[PDB]
Structure 1
Amino acid sequence: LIYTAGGYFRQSLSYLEAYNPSDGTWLRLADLQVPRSGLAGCVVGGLLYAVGGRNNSPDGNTDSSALDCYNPMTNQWSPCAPMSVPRNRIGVGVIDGHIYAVGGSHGCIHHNSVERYEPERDEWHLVAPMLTRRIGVGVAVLNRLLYAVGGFDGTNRLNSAECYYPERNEWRMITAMNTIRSGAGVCVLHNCIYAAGGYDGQDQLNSVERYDVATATWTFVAPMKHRRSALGITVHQGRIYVLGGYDGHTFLDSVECYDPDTDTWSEVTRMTSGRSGVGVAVT
């Protein structure tokens, strides 16, 4: 199943909900111990990790350096070592059982730093920084390379993407996207990096484009039904799901699913409540 953790509707949320694309049901589990939005979700060793984000509440607006681990059989959260810095609107990828925490903001500081967590030592350590400061950055791993895609540097929203090589600790700019995208959903479906939606500084986007490594080319595919930024995104059974987000007026509950063979989007699900800025992952 695909778990969504955190999110935001009037305040940051502690929801942990699981969607069944087979039954179409929603299964609700333990609350996050601290509410979080603008966080990222991943899975390592079947354990679900929630990374960074922020607690935007009626009494505060605290950027999170926290990393928290959910175990699907135990149904319980456990704190892990926290990152060097708080990272709101962070991006994360998984390579060789390690957690990469990418960019994000703390206050008005927009990070270019990246750090790496290893679950069996419970430690973070900094690696080479990106060439660009990026919050709202989409992150993906393909051929066990780490891609940071789009985002916002504090001033400009970005269509650039860069690649991190683990065995040299270096970042390389790649071909930029056709569209400037901050707060897009970025994943690796089959073997292209997919960037769906986001915000270009004036409009939320429903366009989706994908990066083909062999040709270093971005190509437009089926555009999403409903424009959305700050969306959750994951791949289930070889097809992509995008959950929630913001369209400039309302917090979406819509969940869309992309079939890569037909190249078609349409509405699969409502979340139990509309929200943006969730962390999504599958186990």
Structure 2
Amino acid sequence: GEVLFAVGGWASGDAISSVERYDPQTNEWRMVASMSKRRCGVGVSVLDDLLYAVGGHDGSSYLNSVERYDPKTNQWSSDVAPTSTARTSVGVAVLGGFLYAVGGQDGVSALNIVERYDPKENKWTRVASMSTRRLGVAVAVLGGFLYAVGGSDGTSPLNTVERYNPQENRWHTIAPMGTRRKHLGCAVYQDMIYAVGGRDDTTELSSAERYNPRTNQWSPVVAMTSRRSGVGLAVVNGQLMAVGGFDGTTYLKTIEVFDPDANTWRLYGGMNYRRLGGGVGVIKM
């Protein structure tokens, strides 16, 4: 019994600050309190049951602030300590009770820096930079181990993957993906790391790949219904689904769910807002 939050920031042209919640109980996509400031290309990941939204473009300012959201009370608070530098199109994940925010874009030369966050102290301190700059990267965590999947450096989209050990504070490159993917989506379905969608060197795309943590090799996966660049992906009370994105025509608001026993994707109704590059969070209630 989980729910998926969606914190998007791309539509028509203007960034958006509306936040959406899906509960499978009623199977409805009803809204919640919008974010106190628009965030374009957000990073979000829940940290002990509080949705965290790490800054991004608001339509003009790239921005460095952070906002958390208490889902039980429906309240957004801009009280979390800011970041070192203003950056957008950055993935974030949670691990060992600390909030890691990987590299992104800041209107100059991508970024490879990675900074943590102590929720108990609000310090927000920086750990080991990443090597190979990554904007529009998606992240995931398998085996207490923080993975940075794909993205774009200063010039081209990447197929390389770098994993991080918090205790030794250093990065270790691992198996490159099949295809180059910037603005992809990742979660940790079925004790493997699935990555779907994105945009390669040319066009948006629908292929998908799974990484086996125990063989250290990526395995191609069945493709989605439509191309979906700048998407999110999260596993909700059992089922893997990707959300929103772009496909070379219009902003998407639909979601697809992976059925492993049938090895295909099934389009569902989807959310209200058409979301490009919009983070997702998952909470159990």
TM-score, normalised by the number of residues in structure 1: 0.96
Aligned to 2:39: 36
Note the residue ranges of structure 2 that are not aligned, 5 or more in a row.
none
Task: Indicate the residue corresponding to 1:14 in structure 2.
Answer: 17
What residue identity is the alignment partner of 1:82?
P
2-structure distance, mates of 1:46, 1:251: 29
**What do residues 190-229 of structure 1 show as CA deviations (whole Å, max 9, x unaligned)?**
2111110100021111011010011111111221111011
Q: How does 1:217-232 map onto structure 2 within 5 Å?
A: 217-232=217-232
Using the TM superposition, give the Cα deviation of residue 189 of structure 1 relative to its aligned residue in structure 2, in angstroms.
1.0
Rounded to whole Å, the distance in 2 between the matches of 1:268 and 1:214 is 32
Q: Quote the residue 1:207 is aligned against.
A: 207
Structure 1, residues 117-141: CA drift from partner, whole Å, max 9, x if none? 1212112111001111000101011
Conservation of the 8 A alpha-carbon contact between 2:139 and 2:186 = yes
Aligned to 2:6: 4
The secondary structure found in structure 2 opposite 1:25 is coil
* Structure 2 counterparts to residues 149-160 of structure 1, below 5 A: 149-160=149-160
Match of 2:259 in 1: 259
Report what 2:98 is aligned to.
Answer: 98
In the TM superposition, 1:224-243 aligns within 5 A as 224-243=224-243
Shift in Å, 1:31: 1.1
Q: CA deviation at 1:23?
A: 2.5
Shift of 1:22: 3.5
Note if contact 2:259-2:266 (Cα within 8 Å) is conserved in structure 1.
Answer: no
Shift of 1:157: 0.6
Aligned mates of 2:185, 2:272 — CA distance in 1: 20
Correspondence for 1:75? 74
- 1:65 matched to which residue of 2? 64
- The structure with the greater share of residues assigned to strand is 1
Distance 1:20 1:269 in 2: 13
**2:250 corresponds to:** 250
Write the deviation string for residues 12-47 of structure 1: whole angstroms up to 9, x where unpaired. Answer: 111111012333211111110000110111111211
Task: Render the CA deviation track for 1:58-102: whole Å, top value 9, x for unaligned.
Answer: xxx111211111001221111200111122110111111111101
The one-letter code of the counterpart of 1:27 is R
For structure 1, list consecutive stretches of 5 or more residues without a partner in the other structure.
Answer: none
* CA RMSD of superposed structures (Å): 1.1
The residue matched to 2:245 in structure 1 has which SS?
A: coil
Separation (CA, whole Å) in 2 of partners of 1:27 and 1:148 = 31
Q: Secondary structure at the match of 1:126?
A: coil
Distance in 1 (alpha carbons) for counterparts of 2:86 and 2:240: 29
Whole-angstrom CA distance in 1 between matches of 2:275 and 2:65: 21
Give the conservation status (yes or no) of the 8 Å contact 1:115–1:126: yes
Q: Which amino acid aligns with 2:9?
A: G
- Counterpart residue identity of residue 71, structure 1: D
Cross-structure match for 1:112: 112
Residue 183 of structure 2 is aligned to residue 180 of structure 1: no
Partners of 1:77 and 1:109 in 2: how far apart? 32
Give the Cα separation in 1 of the matches to 2:270 and 2:210: 25
What is the letter of the counterpart of residue 210 of structure 1? R
SS in 2 for 1:26: coil
